[PDB]
Structure formats: C-alpha cells, structure tokens
Amino acid sequence: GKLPPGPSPLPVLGNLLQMDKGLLRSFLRLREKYGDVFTVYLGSRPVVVLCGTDAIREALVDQAEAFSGRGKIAVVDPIFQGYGVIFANGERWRALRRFSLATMRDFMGKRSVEERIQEEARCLVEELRKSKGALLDNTLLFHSITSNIICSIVFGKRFDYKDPVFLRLLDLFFQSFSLISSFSSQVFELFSGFLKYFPGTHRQIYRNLQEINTFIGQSVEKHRATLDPSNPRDFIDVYLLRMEKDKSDPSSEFHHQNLILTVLSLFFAGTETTSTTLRYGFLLMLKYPHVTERVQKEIEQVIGSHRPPALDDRAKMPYTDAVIHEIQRLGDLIPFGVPHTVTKDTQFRGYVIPKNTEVFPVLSSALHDPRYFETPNTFNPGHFLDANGALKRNEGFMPFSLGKRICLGEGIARTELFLFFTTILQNFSIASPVPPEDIDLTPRESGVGNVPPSYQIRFLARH
C-alpha cells in the first residue's frame, strides 16, 4: 500500500520464518526481488531497509532531518533510556551532539586528541617490545588502547596496560559486546516485552553496564570535589560547568543522569569498532606481506625511522592512506548500519513511512558496490589510488555512515587508525604461525558487528 514493498509477513513473527545463517544474505536476496528499498517485519514491527549507495544517500542526505531518528536497541535500553549521543532523540540529541562538538573539537585541557593518540602509540610500542616477539592475541591490547583514548578525553587520564582494576572493568565492558551480539540477545531484541521476566543475557548486560556506571559515577564526584572551573581537564569538567550554568533551566538536559550515560555512550561508540578495525587490518597485513612491505617503505620515505608518526604525515602517504580505507571497506564492521527511525511521516520514492518506523541503512551494500569498487570481495588498495598514485574517494566509501547521525568520532577514529598502524609498523614487522595463503578473512560472527576470526601474531622489533 504505502510502505515499501517486501515479503508477506506472518502475524507475530513477521518475516522471521523466511529469514536466516546470515541476515545480510537475506537482505541481499530480498533486494534481488524487491529492489533497493523494501519492508521487512522483524517481529511484529516493520523495518525499512535501504540497500545500495543511492537509496542510502537519498534517505540520509537528501531527506536528512526526516531520517535523523535513532532506533532503540532493547538489550541495552534499560541501562541507557535514550541518554547519550548514540541513543538520544530530538532536542536532547541535538544539544548533546552540539555540546560534544563544541567540546571534543577543543582539546580544555591544553593537550590535543592527536597528541594523546601519539602518546598511547608510544606506550603501545614499549609494551609490545616487552613481548620479545612471542606469539600473542592482540585483542586485549587493541581494546586497551582505544579505551585509553576515551579515558584520556573523558577522565583526563590513561591506564597502564596491566592495571588489574582497569582490566577487570575492561573485561566486563567488552564481554557486554560479545553478549549483545549473541543469539540470545537477538531473540531478546524481538521478544523483550516477554523475555524481560525470564533469566538471560540481558540480565548480565544490565549488571555489567551498571557496574561500569558505578565507576563512572564515582569519577564524576571526584572531578567535582577537585574541580578548577578556570582549568577544565576533560569532558566531565566541561560538562560539570555546563550543569551549573544551566542550573536555572529545567528544560535543560544537562544533568547528572545524562552525564553518566553519555560518558558510557562514548566508550560504547568509541572503542569496539575501532579496536576491531585494527585487529582486522593486522589480519590483512599478515595475509598480504607485500602490502605491509609497501606501507613500511612509505613510512621510511616520508617519516623515517626515528621521529614518531604525526597526522600531517598522512596527506603525504597516499598508499598507507589507501590501505586504511580498504581495511575499513573490506572489513565492513557495521554491515547493516546502526538502526535509524523517521522523525515524522515521510515521503520517499512514492512510499510513505510513518513516523518512528525503523530504518536500516545497509552500509555493506555501499562498501561492496561494483559501481565504486572494481573488485569488491578482494583486498585491493588500488580501490583508493588514481593513475598518478594519489588518493581518491568516491561515494561508495561510507563506513562511518552519512547525514545528521554520521559518526561523531570519525576524525578521531581515522587518527587512531593512522597513528596506531604506522607507529606499530614503523617499529615492528609481523609474523604468524599460519602462512598467508591459509589465512581466512571470513567473519567468525557476521552479525551487527562482523567479527574477524581470532589469530596469533608476533611483533618483531625492527633494526
């Protein structure tokens, strides 16, 4: 009728009995029948699925405001309750977002995000030197360094990598991601009005997250008791000042609740995905030693062996830059996008999408678009190099998404990827027990997060 066309749904279950192995391949078969915009019933509610670069741009870019709503994730909603950037809607979201930009684009205290990442990179190198070339799983370290960048921005400090209190909270935090992406939580996302009365992963997510909130909560009180309003140290200080100022407005959103959850929001948006992109990139660098060998020769040409890599070096390193883009593209770590909603009844391609309908923008269908990518299932830095060896970007490259919800941390993310990759490869070459030809790139869990398989790697200190 009005909604976009899609397969006919059963009553309670919607189109689930007809869905899968992987949702991505179902969406992909459904696109083959119904085209680039279609309706699927994942449970009783309808979801509009945007496939292809085009549909996604028309929605999120041309009718941006309409498509700037955030879809609820019920597994973590009883913790978040729509606080924090990545979870907020309407005026709360606008204000939280403008404030974060007005804030994190101002690094109150004196040291920049870039300098902090360079410092984390130095600490990483020294720590990896201690391994002496022994086989390791880099999961823990890569979680630790990206957490550390958020800790630095929000709490004004980093943690040592063997800090066992930090590691205990870190284990809890990232276990909450393994759990949110489990079947038991998928089923929960569909039947939460019922299963919330039973035992399950949701009770474990809740407890793990509330335990982290407790420590965030204690850090806020410590910041307040130690505050110098003339020299804010970090995000929390700046936010505490803004609470006072707006103290006389009860339409103001700048309260204690919003602060704990926004902080936990930033860890949640800012760590796992970046960490996993790093872990994926090093899997590709083992798989293709010639690429890693060329990135090293670019590092030596432009940077040298001595001084630390800096962000201005990127513009002079189009090859390494193209390798990073291509790790993000092939890596495809958020394949279905993060769910949106429409904020009003919305006309779109002759269809009507009623307010608050959920919408999935399937970024994967853009990252693999054969219009923009000659060989989409194969690792190829060439995708982002022109005939003169300079970097090119095209409209298929939308790993951070688009429009009003575009990744708030994009520039930080790319700085992390750039400085972590080059400062590591400047100092270490790499070797694994599995030869390149036997290395498998196929995601071990292809859900909302597309996880690379576990592997072991050596970091061999250079010259």
Ligand X SMILES: OC[C@H]1O[C@H](O[C@H]2[C@H](O)[C@@H](O)[C@H](OCCCCCC3CCCCC3)O[C@@H]2CO)[C@H](O)[C@@H](O)[C@@H]1O
Residue tagged 């995708």 (tokens) = 383
Of the pair 169, 391, the CB lying nearest ligand X is at 169
Give the total of residues touching ligand HEM (CB under 6 A): 24
Query: What's the rounded Cα separation, in Å, for the pair 377 and 290?
Result: 19
Stretch that binds ligand X, among 48-56, 71-79, 210-218, 306-314 (CB under 6 A): 210-218
Phi-psi region of 299 (alpha: psi -120 to 50; beta: other; left: phi over 0): alpha
Query: What's the rounded Cα separation, in Å, for the pair 253 and 241?
Result: 13
Residue type, 172: L
Stretch that binds ligand X, among 38-46, 102-110, 214-222, 359-367 (CB under 6 A): 214-222
Interaction between residue 432 and ligand HEM (CB under 6 A): no
**407 annotated as ligand-binding:** yes
Burial (CB count within 10 angstroms: exposed 0-12, middle 13-18, buried 19+), residue 389: exposed
Query: What's the rounded Cα separation, in Å, for the pair 373 and 299?
Result: 26
Closest approach, Cβ 289 to ligand 06X, in A, equals 29
Residue whose C-alpha is closest to residue 85's, from 237, 258, 335: 258
Q: How large is the angle between the packed helices 164-180 and 183-195, nearest 10 degrees? A: 80
186 binds, among ligand X, ligand 06X, ligand HEM, none (CB under 5 to 8 A by kind): ligand 06X
Other beta carbons less than 10 A from residue 218's beta carbon: 10
* Per-residue contact flags (x/-) with ligand 06X for residues 231 to 270, judged by CB under 6 A: -------------------------------------xx-
Interaction between residue 151 and ligand HEM (CB under 6 A): no
Stretch that binds ligand HEM, among 134-142, 165-173, 283-291, 405-413 (CB under 6 A): 405-413
Residue type, 264: L
Tokens of 30: 């459904």
Query: What's the rounded Cα separation, in Å, for the pair 78 and 205?
Result: 10
Give the total of residues touching ligand 06X (CB under 6 A): 27
CA dihedral 278, 284, 285, 287 (to 10 degrees): 150
Interaction between residue 55 and ligand HEM (CB under 6 A): no
Q: Which residues in the 259-318 window bind ligand X by CB under 6 A?
A: 267
Q: Which residues in the 338-397 window bind ligand 06X by CB under 6 A?
A: 338, 358
Q: CA distances (Å), 171 to each of 120, 277, 336, in order?
A: 20, 19, 26
215 binds, among ligand 06X, ligand X, ligand HEM, none (CB under 5 to 8 A by kind): ligand X
Tokens of 294: 């060329």
Q: Which residues in the 15-74 window bind ligand 06X by CB under 6 A?
A: 23, 42-43, 45, 47, 73
Contact yes or no for 76/180 (Cβ under 8 A): yes
What is the CB-side half-sphere exposure of residue 44 using CA atoms within 13 A?
A: 5
Contact yes or no for 295/320 (Cβ under 8 A): yes
Closest approach, Cβ 448 to ligand HEM, in A, equals 11
Contact yes or no for 280/452 (Cβ under 8 A): yes
165 binds, among ligand HEM, ligand 06X, ligand X, none (CB under 5 to 8 A by kind): ligand X
Q: Which residues in the 264-283 window bind ligand HEM by CB under 6 A?
A: 266, 269-270, 273-274, 277
155 binds, among ligand HEM, ligand 06X, ligand X, none (CB under 5 to 8 A by kind): ligand X
Of the residues 396, 409, 447, 452, which one makes contact with ligand HEM according to CB under 6 A: 409
| Upstream peptide bond of 109 is cis (omega within 30 degrees of 0) | yes
Query: What's the rounded Cα separation, in Å, for the pair 133 and 461?
Result: 7
Interaction between residue 113 and ligand HEM (CB under 6 A): no
Contact yes or no for 56/50 (Cβ under 8 A): yes
* Per-residue contact flags (x/-) with ligand X for residues 148 to 187, judged by CB under 6 A: -------x---------xx--xx--x--------------
Q: Which residues in the 373-402 window bind ligand HEM by CB under 6 A?
A: 399-401
Residues in contact with ligand 06X by CB under 6 A are 23, 42-43, 45, 47, 73, 75, 86, 177, 180-181, 185-186, 189-190, 268-269, 272-273, 334, 336, 338, 358, 407, 447-449
Site residues, ligand X (CB under 6 A)? 147, 155, 165-166, 169-170, 173, 212, 215-216, 219, 267
Site residues for ligand HEM per CB under 6 A: 70, 85-86, 97, 266, 269-270, 273-274, 277, 333-334, 337-338, 399-401, 405-409, 412-413
Annotated binding site: 407
